[PDB]
Design an enzyme around this catalytic site. Structure first.
Site, PDB file in Angstrom:
ATOM      1  CG  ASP A 192      44.582  35.992  43.693  1.00 32.08           C
ATOM      2  OD1 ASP A 192      43.834  36.105  42.684  1.00 32.08           O
ATOM      3  OD2 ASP A 192      44.708  36.886  44.559  1.00 32.08           O
ATOM      4  CD  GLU A 250      38.509  32.687  37.088  1.00 30.68           C
ATOM      5  OE1 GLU A 250      38.597  32.870  35.848  1.00 30.68           O
ATOM      6  OE2 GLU A 250      37.527  32.986  37.783  1.00 30.68           O
ATOM      7  N   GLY A 259      36.324  35.505  38.323  1.00 30.80           N
ATOM      8  CA  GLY A 259      35.150  35.203  37.492  1.00 30.80           C
ATOM      9  C   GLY A 259      35.384  35.395  36.001  1.00 30.80           C
ATOM     10  CG  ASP A 278      40.081  41.846  44.596  1.00 36.06           C
ATOM     11  OD1 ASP A 278      39.906  40.617  44.332  1.00 36.06           O
ATOM     12  OD2 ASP A 278      41.195  42.323  44.824  1.00 36.06           O
TER      13      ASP A 278
END
Length: 461
Positions: free
Chosen positions: A214, A249, A251, A272
């Protein structure tokens, strides 16, 4: 139904692994139990357990190997090829599995993970190719250890992570884990920035098969992102294992252009996903809009990731229940069908330990999954984005095409399908993948009628 009848050896029929790394594959097999498996022509270093269906070992030499598998039970036999590509590529089909985030959030335990593996063994999912069982955020403690190692939260995983890995591998499952390219994860627990080599070594020693990486708390710069992902990608490749590198990340920096270059095998294209149709923030339809023009960036070994499946959550969630309405079953099915068409990872986010029939009816659709796992690995083109509907097209490896007609609005819609709807379409033989039956409409085409939120998927030759 998955455990009745003659055996049927299910996709994926092609698998990749790095040379000289551990190899593990459970042969996904429908049919009445007990089943016994056979393999002819397994490469040097691999062995099949005929009673469990698990192929295990290590192939040292780079190459493509064609293995003939047979599964037998009291009702008959099935024979099928497994192509093993020992090479520079992982995920020659989209990864399928489960992730702890969308339902459980920070409420991870060793118990949850082993119980999830057991459910998948027993409920049909393992035999349809679901294999990755991924730990998301909060397995680790907030601070790095005084010795410089990341600390497993042993209230949650009291025998450590390797214990879970071992249990999962016993059954042909892969273990995913999570970190962040900063000092702190999205959740505020320990990340990996500056310690990539030491964390990757630890991950490998625990038997980790996949890392989701992440980007919370990292600087927005695109070059900064690329460098940070490259550090971890190189660290993973310096271990003694084939570890999948899932880039996350959201996009923001067009990861489809550079993720493969830094060693990623999948990359998040959006923020998300929420358990909602159309705006825990992005709706299913918003994610389609993002992913539609990215089809040229996906192929075997590198996939656009439209995020975890929300099939079966129905609003009930300890991570995304706050900002989520719940969807109709129609909408969940359209969600799964489109994830299949787009050659997306099929990472379930629901609690697979207990599912209703309507959820099982979606997630165990062998034909949609077969589309997803087609060895060509083409992400479907959104051929037509009309005002109220889409037509999506996925060429398949036998020369047929999958066609998905989706209703994006909340009223019924008509979609005309004919041989000029998309390039190279034949309608002489049309199979309805949601009904599991041949379509008896005209070979010159017909009007598809879609209820609100409905997707119909046809295979056309």
């Amino acid at each position: 139904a998955i455990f009745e009848g003659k055996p049927c050896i299910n996709p994926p029929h092609v698998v990749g692994n790095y040379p000289a790394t551990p190899f593990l594959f459970y042969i996904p097999t429908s049919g009445e139990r007990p089943i016994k498996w056979h393999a002819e022509n397994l490469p040097k270093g691999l062995k099949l357990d005929k009673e469990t269906g698990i192929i295990k070992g290590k192939v040292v030499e780079k190459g493509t190997y064609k293995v003939m598998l047979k599964a037998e039970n009291a009702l008959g036999t099935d024979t099928q090829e497994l192509l093993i590509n020992i090479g520079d590529e992982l995920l020659l089909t989209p990864p399928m599995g489960w992730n702890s985030w969308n339902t459980f959030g920070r409420h991870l335990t060793e118990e949850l993970l082993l119980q999830t593996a057991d459910a998948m063994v027993e409920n049909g999912m393992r035999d349809l190719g679901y294999a990755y069982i991924n730990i998301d955020d909060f397995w680790q403690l907030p601070e790095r250890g005084a010795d410089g190692h990341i600390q497993i939260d042993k209230t949650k995983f009291p025998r450590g992570i390797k214990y879970v890995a071992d249990y999962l591998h016993e059954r042909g499952f892969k273990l995913g884990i999570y970190s962040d390219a900063a000092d702190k994860t999205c959740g505020g627990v320990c990340g990996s920035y500056g310690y990539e080599e030491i964390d990757a070594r630890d991950f490998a020693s625990w038997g980790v098969d996949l890392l989701k990486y992440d980007y919370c708390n990292a600087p927005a710069g695109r070059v900064e992102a690329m460098e940070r992902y490259e550090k971890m990608g190189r660290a993973l490749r310096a271990t003694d294992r084939s570890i999948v590198f899932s880039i996350c990340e959201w996009g923001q920096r067009e990861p489809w252009k550079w993720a493969k270059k830094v060693g990623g095998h999948l990359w998040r294209v959006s923020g998300d996903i929420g358990d909602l149709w159309n705006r825990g923030l992005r709706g299913i339809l918003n994610i389609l809009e993002i992913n539609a023009p990215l089809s040229e960036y996906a192929r075997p070994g590198g996939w656009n990731d439209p995020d975890m499946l929300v099939v079966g959550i129905g609003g009930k969630s300890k991570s995304i229940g706050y900002e989520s309405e719940g969807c109709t079953n129609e909408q969940y099915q359209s969600h799964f069908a489109l994830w299949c068409m787009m050659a997306s990872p099929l990472l379930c986010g629901n609690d697979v330990r207990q599912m209703n029939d309507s959820t099982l009816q979606i997630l165990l659709n062998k034909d949609l999954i077969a589309i997803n796992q087609d060895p060509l690995g083409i992400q479907a083109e959104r051929a037509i984005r009309a005002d109220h509907y889409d037509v999506w097209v996925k060429p398949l490896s036998d020369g047929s095409k999958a066609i998905a007609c989706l209703n994006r609005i909340s009223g019924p819609v008509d979609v005309e399908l004919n041989v000029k709807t998309v390039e190279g379409l034949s309608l002489d033989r049309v199979y309805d993948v949601i009904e599991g039956s041949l379509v008896a409409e005209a070979s010159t085409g017909w009007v598809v009628k879609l209820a609100p939120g409905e997707c119909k998927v046809f295979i056309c030759k």
